[PDB]
Design a binder for these strands. Structure first.
Length: 49
DNA sequence: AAAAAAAAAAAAAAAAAAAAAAAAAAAAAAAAAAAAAAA
């Protein structure tokens, strides 16, 4: 809202629920995505293959 | 005319900034165990 851009609430609440799903702060880095419980090929496709 | 030493050609060889997590070392209070004084 500083730049006057409007994004719908669902697309923001989905991200806010993705980060707070595990009970702590799951950042969107290589330290939060690669520390999840997903598959090996999914995690190696992003960073630190 | 046959045998040996030095020079030159051919072939193999080795020489940038940011940010987060983990490891480490000095410190520091706490707690359990051992030695000494007194009743």
């Amino acid at each position: 809202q500083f730049y006057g851009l409007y994004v719908n609430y669902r697309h923001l609440a989905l991200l806010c629920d993705v980060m707070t799903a595990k009970g702590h702060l799951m950042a969107i880095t290589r330290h939060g995505i690669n520390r999840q419980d997903t598959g090996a090929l999914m995690r190696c496709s992003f960073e630190e293959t």
